[PDB]
């Protein structure tokens with residue numbers, strides 16, 4: 249009943265961005281369920297500031313350490329050096345027994361590097377996703393490869409991601425298939441009774457929900473996307489597009505330039521994860537280049553056109569929910585037009601399934617970690 | 624006859640340490656033999672200052688860029704941040720077509736990272752060496768793994784190193800077996816006519832040449848080594864040991880403490896590569912934890928006891944020249960004592976062969992690079 253604090257494994261979770269925070273929040277909550285076995289320490293780089301805080305506030309997570317590294321229009325070098333120097337300091341102070349990193353951000357990479365530089369084991373949550381193209385996604389494909397060679401334990405969401413690691417000669421006895429913790433989060437946010445102003449001003453129109461921020465999509469590719477979206481809106485009078493625009497000033501310039509003040513297109517601030525998941529669940533069609541949206545959509549049964557030349561979510565393609573659209577204006581327009589015009593085409597994409605698991609990934613991760621240390 | 628400078632591929636070679644410099648010098652020399660096809664740019668981090676300059680002076684190589692990063696008793700984080708920031712600036716200025724990195728130093732890793740952060744292709748000279756132990760050698764095993772996932776072209780010295788990359792799912796069409804460039808260097812330094820004071824004071828004694836600097840060997844392991852070496856000198860009256868002591872203050876403390884002022888043991892400053900190769904060629908036995916010495920010794924037919932728990936030079940073990948001794952004082956003593964006492968044990972290790980190639984690696988590497996770019 250009382251908590252004995254005297255014999256605990258120090259587990260440090262490290263992340264710095266909105267998507268990492270959403271996917272790591274369930275894991276933090278799960279670590280906290282084992283207070284006599286685990287001292288759970290949360291460290292954030294704050295590679296993101298506002299969009300990170302948005303997530304921390306929903307889950308009620310106060311970091312033990314916060315490096316506050318974000319700069320305006322920061323470079324990959326800014327994040328790499330500020331993150332590394334700060335994390336090395338945190339690790340020397342707290343001396344964790346294992347560092348847990350997530351996915352494929354630059355934070356993921358330098359968190360892994362800092363752990364290695366202190367000879368601290370690394371557990372890679374969301375391990376083994378691949379496009380095999382180091383310039384798509386850039387720099388995320390490289391971040392998850394780099395992290396891959398540093399990690400001591402690999403928590404693969406799916407059988408294919410496990411296979412990817414096996415094919416790279418990782419230790420088979422260090423690879424575990426858990427499901428994606430995205431689903432752990434999703435099952436607690438979605439809810440039957442829900443309203444939002446976006447959904448108020450819709451009337452009985454069909455909602456197209458969009459997000460766009462991939463680094464390699466900046467500039468020409470996003471302009472192509474946005475012009476296709478205006479043409480869809482021109483053609484389909486009963487559609488409203490809602491775009492919670494990423495905080496990157498570059499994205500915002502392009503968004504404002506092409507879509508600003510256009511009727512039935514609503515550029516809004518980033519939604520918190522409860523609002524976003526619930527609005528997504530109630531959407532007719534999503535247009536996105538987001539990674540997490542690709543894992544969430546199948547469970548919601550909501551068709552998604554992926555606005556990239558690659559994806560590392562092949563399981564959502566196989567589920568029917570996801571379709572790769574590329575970044576060419578005419579091709580995006582054509583594919584989106586067919587889904588908004590042809591109900592049978594839409595029907596093929598709207599069967600709900602759970603290719604990314606049952607929302608119990610976090611339990612499995614904590615178990616694996618304890619067993620690894622014989623704790 | 625005249626050199627047309629107007630249509631050249633910009634090739635930037637990057638390195639920062641003595642061993643990289645020795646292994647890259649032949650390559651820089653060979654790139655320079657193609658002045659109408661290639662603009663050869665040499666960039667150094669000067670992770671090493673004095674020991675790097677010693678090499679550049681022998682080969683007569685004046686860097687185009689010199690970051691001068693070295694700090695006294697620097698950390699891996701020092702190298703990583705100062706190296707990344709400086710190389711990013713050099714790459715943005717020079718805009719090379721390809722960056723060539725060598726081996727497994729921290730410079731190798733952050734040179735590859737800076738290229739990637741500038742979407743510049745990377746060619747990895749000395750690609751695919753593995754112990755599969757990320758703490759032995761530390762951090763070199765991780766550096767070559769990290770560099771491996773970044774590299775576009777892989778110049779493997781040997782069939783086994785190529786196989787290692789193949790087993791990690793590297794693109795087979797980007798892996799090339801060339802021989803090790805260490806041999807390209809060696810064939811030009813060793814000479815039949817040579818003297819040096821170290822050799823004069825030998826009389827007709829047997830020379831044991833030693834070097835020790837591996838990061839994971841600092842402290843207790845080196846102390847074991849050095850105590851073993853004193854005992855060997857005590858037992859074998861006709862032996863003199865020469866130790867060109869690495870500039871790391873930590874090594875120097877241990878060296879001076881245990882081996883300072885001991886009769887028939889000669890602690891000296893680092894030898895230039897001509898002096899070192901020629902003194903090695905004329906040694907009875909080497910005791911080392913150097914990587915380069917392991918590649919050079921077989922071609923010289925000089926037995927080596929490797930003072931590590933691992934090696935990634937298995938081909939020299941197979942040649943008979945190299946024997947793994949570990950870092951235990953009694954074991955090192957025993958193995959060295961047998962080689963200095965038993966002529967048939969020594970004979971087994973002293974047959975010269977060229978398991979690391981024919982000293983034409985650099986030619987092959989430049990050929991591969993030109994063909995890659997259709998130049």
Ligand SMILES: CC(=O)N[C@H]1[C@@H](OP(=O)(O)OP(=O)(O)OC[C@@H]2O[C@@H](n3ccc(=O)[nH]c3=O)[C@H](O)[C@@H]2O)O[C@H](CO)[C@@H](O)[C@@H]1O
Pocket residue numbers: 265266267295296297298299300318319320321322323327352353354355386387388461463494495496497
């Ligand atoms: C290499 C890397 O790790 N990129 C990640 C990053 O890209 P993202 O494109 O967000 O890149 P950064 O995290 O560098 O942020 C660029 C930034 O946008 C602005 N900014 C960002 C967040 C914020 O809360 N407030 C703010 O003002 C700042 O000017 C800042 O410099 O986050 C995305 C999630 O959204 C992830 O999908 C990407 O994998």
Ligand SMILES: CC(=O)N[C@H]1[C@@H](OP(=O)(O)OP(=O)(O)OC[C@@H]2O[C@@H](n3ccc(=O)[nH]c3=O)[C@H](O)[C@@H]2O)O[C@H](CO)[C@@H](O)[C@@H]1O
Pocket residue numbers: 640641642670671672673674675693694695696697698699702727728729730761762763836838869870871872
């Ligand atoms: C992480 C890494 O890349 N390590 C490489 C480095 O280790 P090495 O042990 O030399 O490590 P560093 O290059 O950081 O050097 C520590 C250093 O030793 C002293 N110093 C070194 C060189 C010099 O010219 N002058 C000088 O004074 C300095 O105080 C300096 O901080 O070089 C070795 C070659 O010798 C390589 O086998 C190692 O792979």
Ligand SMILES: O=c1ccn([C@@H]2O[C@H](COP(=O)(O)OP(=O)(O)O)[C@@H](O)[C@H]2O)c(=O)[nH]1
Pocket residue numbers: 266267270459492517518519520521522524525537538539540541544
């Ligand atoms: O306005 C938004 C947009 C997205 N998300 C969520 O943020 C995560 C994805 O983050 P993002 O698209 O920024 O990055 P990526 O997944 O592409 O790394 C997913 O869980 C989304 O459900 C959100 O809560 N509000």
Ligand SMILES: O=c1ccn([C@@H]2O[C@H](COP(=O)(O)OP(=O)(O)O)[C@@H](O)[C@H]2O)c(=O)[nH]1
Pocket residue numbers: 641642645805834867868892893894895896897899900912913914915916919
């Ligand atoms: O005093 C010395 C010691 C070694 N070397 C040469 O330096 C290279 C290897 O450098 P080092 O042992 O410092 O590092 P490592 O090979 O372990 O990376 C080899 O070519 C050696 O022949 C040298 O020229 N002078």
